[PDB]
Amino acid sequence: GANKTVVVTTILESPYVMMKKNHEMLEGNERYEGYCVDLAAEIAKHCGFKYKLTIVGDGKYGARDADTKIWNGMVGELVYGKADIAIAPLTITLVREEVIDFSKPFMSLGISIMIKKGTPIESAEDLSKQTEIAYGTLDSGSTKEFFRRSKIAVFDKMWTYMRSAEPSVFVRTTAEGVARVRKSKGKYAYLLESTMNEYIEQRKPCDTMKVGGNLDSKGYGIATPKGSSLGTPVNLAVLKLSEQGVLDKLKNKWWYDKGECG
Amino acid sequence: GANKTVVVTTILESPYVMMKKNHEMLEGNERYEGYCVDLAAEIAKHCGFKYKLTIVGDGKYGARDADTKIWNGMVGELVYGKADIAIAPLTITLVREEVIDFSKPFMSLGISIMIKKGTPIESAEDLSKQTEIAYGTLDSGSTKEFFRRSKIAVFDKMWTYMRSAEPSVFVRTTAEGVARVRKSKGKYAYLLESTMNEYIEQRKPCDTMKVGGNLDSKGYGIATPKGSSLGTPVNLAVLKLSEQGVLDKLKNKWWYDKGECG
Numbered sequence: 001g002a003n004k005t006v007v008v009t010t011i012l013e014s015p016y017v018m019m020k021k022n023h024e025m026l027e028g029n030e031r032y033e034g035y036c037v038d039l040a041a042e043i044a045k046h047c048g049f050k051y052k053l054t055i056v057g058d059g060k061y062g063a064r065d066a067d068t069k070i071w072n073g074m075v076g077e078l079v080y081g082k083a084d085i086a087i088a089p090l091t092i093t094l095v096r097e098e099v100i101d102f103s104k105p106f107m108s109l110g111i112s113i114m115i116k117k118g119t120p121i122e123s124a125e126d127l128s129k130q131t132e133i134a135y136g137t138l139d140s141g142s143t144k145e146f147f148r149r150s151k152i153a154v155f156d157k158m159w160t161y162m163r164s165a166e167p168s169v170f171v172r173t174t175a176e177g178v179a180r181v182r183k184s185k186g187k188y189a190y191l192l193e194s195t196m197n198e199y200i201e202q203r204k205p206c207d208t209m210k211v212g213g214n215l216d217s218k219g220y221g222i223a224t225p226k227g228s229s230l231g232t233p234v235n236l237a238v239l240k241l242s243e244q245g246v247l248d249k250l251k252n253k254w255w256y257d258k259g260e261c262g
Numbered sequence: 263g264a265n266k267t268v269v270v271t272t273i274l275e276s277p278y279v280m281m282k283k284n285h286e287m288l289e290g291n292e293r294y295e296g297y298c299v300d301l302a303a304e305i306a307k308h309c310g311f312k313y314k315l316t317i318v319g320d321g322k323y324g325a326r327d328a329d330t331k332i333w334n335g336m337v338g339e340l341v342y343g344k345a346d347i348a349i350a351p352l353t354i355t356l357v358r359e360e361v362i363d364f365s366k367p368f369m370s371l372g373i374s375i376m377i378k379k380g381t382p383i384e385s386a387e388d389l390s391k392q393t394e395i396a397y398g399t400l401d402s403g404s405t406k407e408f409f410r411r412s413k414i415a416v417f418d419k420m421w422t423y424m425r426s427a428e429p430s431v432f433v434r435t436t437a438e439g440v441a442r443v444r445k446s447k448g449k450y451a452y453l454l455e456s457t458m459n460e461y462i463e464q465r466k467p468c469d470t471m472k473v474g475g476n477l478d479s480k481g482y483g484i485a486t487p488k489g490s491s492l493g494t495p496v497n498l499a500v501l502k503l504s505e506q507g508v509l510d511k512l513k514n515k516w517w518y519d520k521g522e523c524g
């Protein structure tokens with residue numbers, strides 16, 4: 001039938017999507033800025049659609065409830081027909097691939113360790129072999145699932161600790177994880193995606209550090225409801241933007257051009 | 263109908279697929295070893311198919327002839343129905359995505375510079391601004407197309423030079439490119455994927471170096487004829503192998519465990 005306004009689900013996660021400081025003075029898509037705001041504009045231009053940016057109601061990435069089997073977050077939005085596409089730092093995983101479609105990756109990342117500067121930790125092995133420094137992850141996302149599912153001794157050991165740590169080591173948002181690292185005098189390390197870790201390392205007050213190598217290697221994809229006719233042109237648009245250098249240019253724009261730590 | 267033997271196209275490219283030294287004494291799949299030999303076995307196990315490894319007839323990755331519009335290499339094999347799947351270091355590109363299917367990436371890479379040790383070159387910018395050191399790429403693959411298509415000043419300048427350099431700076435195989443770097447007393451630099459570059463840097467006689475950062479960021483995918491029912495389970499198998507750490511384990515096996523330079 002007639003072209004419709006494509007409803008885009010995304011998440012408030014810096015520097016992917018952020019409220020403009022003058023957002024009260026603005027309407028619709030103009031309220032927001034960031035990497036994924038720019039990316040949504042590029043994808044829409046190349047695929048020739050009109051779109052509305054919306055922030056996921058529950059503020060989550062997406063996980064299936066073990067009891068209800070219901071998906072929450074942006075993944076839920078797609079599965080239950082509440083959004084047409086997700087343009088966000090949404091990690092490509094086996095369990096999600098079964099229920100939604102993903103483009104080829106538009107950005108790579110791996111799980112990584114964030115410490116307050118001078119914390120005596122170099123690696124996941126270090127974290128696993130001590131108790132004084134607590135560590136955890138975001139809940140409802142791919143990092144938590146990684147540890148939950150891992151057969152690898154060090155990661156299995158970390159999971160056994162985190163799942164029963166008191167008080168809880170899990171956080172509701174990335175900004176919470178960062179706030180805990182900053183305020184815990186080095187007694188909390190935060191396990192998060194290297195992309196978010198590298199962005200925060202370039203933000204005032206420049207008191208955090210990404211340490212050691214990444215624990216895994218993967219990517220974010222643009223997601224669509226399974227079988228959506230949008231998936232094909234969106235995937236081809238991601239490949240063009242990659243091959244044109246536009247994705248690299250957008251990463252430089254939002255991570256390093258505006259970087260606050262020198 | 264009945265299950266059939268899946269015909270796998272691949273390429274002799276170290277350490278992805280190599281002849282076993284005792285290959286004369288062996289039959290069928292047992293002739294070969296390498297990262298992609300191991301990967302093919304894993305994919306086949308998880309998807310439950312029997313398969314025959316074959317080496318692409320023309321020894322190429324795949325390009326479309328500007329005049330005939332005919333695809334050569336492994337891409338051609340898939341397009342014209344001569345193979346059922348390609349399990350090789352085959353780069354995901356826009357032009358290929360239009361005519362074949364690709365899984366999510368099983369390995370990441372970017373274009374990179376290989377020099378003989380002590381060559382006074384640090385970057386693509388350095389290469390572009392001098393003439394004494396010749397440089398080129400593999401023909402019939404994604405690296406050559408990258409330079410051909412690039413709008414980026416430095417890469418555009420490199421392409422203008424390479425396309426008309428005499429004698430020719432392009433090579434038929436990776437091993438040729440390496441042999442030219444090694445034998446040219448530092449007067450030839452070779453532009454190749456960081457994966458191949460990093461493997462050769464760990465092989466005797468340890469006389470080559472990867473220099474500077476990568477020029478782009480992308481990945482290899484397992485490829486199938488467009489619409490093949492094989493694409494779905496193969497893609498899911500790649501995600502499992504990624505999430506299990508098996509892909510990382512296979513990279514360590516073939517690059518670094520056996521590494522010859524310390």
Ligand SMILES: NCCCNC(=O)c1c(NC(=O)Cn2nc(C(F)(F)F)c3c2CCCC3)sc2c1CCCC2
Binds near residue numbers: 220504
């Ligand atoms: N080391 C274990 C697996 C290695 N993994 C990958 O390379 C890998 C990924 N790699 C990448 O995304 C690298 N990568 N691949 C591409 C692509 F798709 F080839 F064009 C692009 C990028 C980065 C920039 C945009 C274009 S995504 C992903 C995996 C495995 C799990 C699923 C999601």
Ligand SMILES: N[C@@H](CCC(=O)O)C(=O)O
Binds near residue numbers: 144192
């Ligand atoms: N990108 C992750 C969220 C962040 C994290 O889990 O570290 C996801 O899509 O679930």
Ligand SMILES: N[C@@H](CCC(=O)O)C(=O)O
Binds near residue numbers: 404
């Ligand atoms: N992986 C490349 C070949 C190697 C190169 O072009 O550097 C391709 O699929 O075409």
